[PDB]
Amino acid sequence: KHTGYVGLKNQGATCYMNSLLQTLFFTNQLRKAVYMMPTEGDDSSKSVPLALQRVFYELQHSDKPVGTKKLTKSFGWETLDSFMQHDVQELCRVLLDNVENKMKGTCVEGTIPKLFRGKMVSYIQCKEVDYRSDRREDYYDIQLSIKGKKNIFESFVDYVAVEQLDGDNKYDAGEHGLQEAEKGVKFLTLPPVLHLQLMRFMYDPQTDQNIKINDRFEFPEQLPLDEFLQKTDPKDPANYILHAVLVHSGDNHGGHYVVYLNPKGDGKWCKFDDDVVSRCTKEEAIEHNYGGHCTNAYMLVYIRESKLSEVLQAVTDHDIPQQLVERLQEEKRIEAQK
Numbered sequence: 001k002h003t004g005y006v007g008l009k010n011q012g013a014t015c016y017m018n019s020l021l022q023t024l025f026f027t028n029q030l031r032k033a034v035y036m037m038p039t040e041g042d043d044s045s046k047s048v049p050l051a052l053q054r055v056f057y058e059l060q061h062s063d064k065p066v067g068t069k070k071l072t073k074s075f076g077w078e079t080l081d082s083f084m085q086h087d088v089q090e091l092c093r094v095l096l097d098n099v100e101n102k103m104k105g106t107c108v109e110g111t112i113p114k115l116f117r118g119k120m121v122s123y124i125q126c127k128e129v130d131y132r133s134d135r136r137e138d139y140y141d142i143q144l145s146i147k148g149k150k151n152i153f154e155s156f157v158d159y160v161a162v163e164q165l166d167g168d169n170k171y172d173a174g175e176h177g178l179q180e181a182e183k184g185v186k187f188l189t190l191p192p193v194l195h196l197q198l199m200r201f202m203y204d205p206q207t208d209q210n211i212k213i214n215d216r217f218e219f220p221e222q223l224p225l226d227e228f229l230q231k232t233d234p235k236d237p238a239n240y241i242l243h244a245v246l247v248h249s250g251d252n253h254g255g256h257y258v259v260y261l262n263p264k265g266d267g268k269w270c271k272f273d274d275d276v277v278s279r280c281t282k283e284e285a286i287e288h289n290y291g292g293h294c295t296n297a298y299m300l301v302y303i304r305e306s307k308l309s310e311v312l313q314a315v316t317d318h319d320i321p322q323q324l325v326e327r328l329q330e331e332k333r334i335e336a337q338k
């Protein structure tokens with residue numbers, strides 16, 4: 001096991017699930033918080049927080065590939081096409097929603113929003129009359145459009161672009177009646193952990209099957225995002241460091257799923273292809289997954305430069321509470337008696 005990291009078992013069309021599991025396991029600040037969840041009273045079959053702790057503990061200690069059968073059962077995606085019908089951000093939403101709820105009233109409460117929550121302003125500004133509506137919204141990831149864009153920069157430029165509201169799509173200004181208006185979105189804050197979903201998988205009207213766009217789309221190792229802030233901080237620039245590259249190889253519905261990571265944030269990359277984990281070049285993790293063949297990234301994880309050390313803080317064996325280790329060791333001991 002030259003890498004020091006252990007892989008995950010392939011047990012059905014779980015698809016990206018193993019890529020997401022490794023991506024979250026190496027969000028060290030999240031892993032430590034998951035261990036701390038008060039789970040001793042949970043039922044080892046229905047509880048999703050406990051199943052997530054099991055996978056993370058096995059990923060941290062086992063020399064052999066880690067199984068995920070109890071995880072898949074815990075949140076109930078068990079039909080033939082259950083993972084084909086959803087995408088990675090829904091799975092990530094199902095998981096993170098459960099652990100943040102599990103952290104209520106506990107010492108790691110608010111860890112999910114601290115890591116992933118950003119602040120955003122959506123607006124509608126009337127062009128002929130003085131009226132404006134701003135709604136501040138939270139976001140936990142960003143869906144980036146890639147069709148027609150060459151890189152992450154053009155995808156952000158398109159994200160904050162202004163939309164015209166005229167013709168049939170005039171704005172209902174209420175007292176002012178129908179009005180021509182401008183609609184857009186501004187970024188207030190960017191989170192410590194940036195999850196960017198690249199919109200390569202979409203449905204084409206009038207549809208039957210979902211289509212995957214394999215156009216070339218580039219992303220940098222370092223991503224400066226001060227430009228897209230309404231107001232910047234001299235002591236905390238929005239400089240982001242590429243951490244994970246979730247990759248798909250194959251055609252529209254069918255394909256292989258792999259994740260690349262430099263878990264320490266030191267630019268030393270590894271390929272997490274299911275159970276096999278191996279060192280790879282930086283070029284293979286980033287440049288080779290631009291596309292333009294059928295292998296390319298569909299989700300990216302960036303960590304803010306000033307937050308790298310805390311998000312990726314060290315995780316030892318003593319960061320797992322004793323009651324947790326006793327229960328899982330009891331579980332491994334029970335199954336070993338067959």
Ligand SMILES: CN1CCC(c2noc(-c3ccc(O)cc3)n2)CC1
Pocket residue numbers: 089090092093096097100112116140141195
């Ligand atoms: C209610 N509260 C906030 C909403 C929801 C949530 N929290 O984070 C995410 C999320 C989704 C996709 C990602 O790629 C990363 C994060 N979803 C559940 C927790």
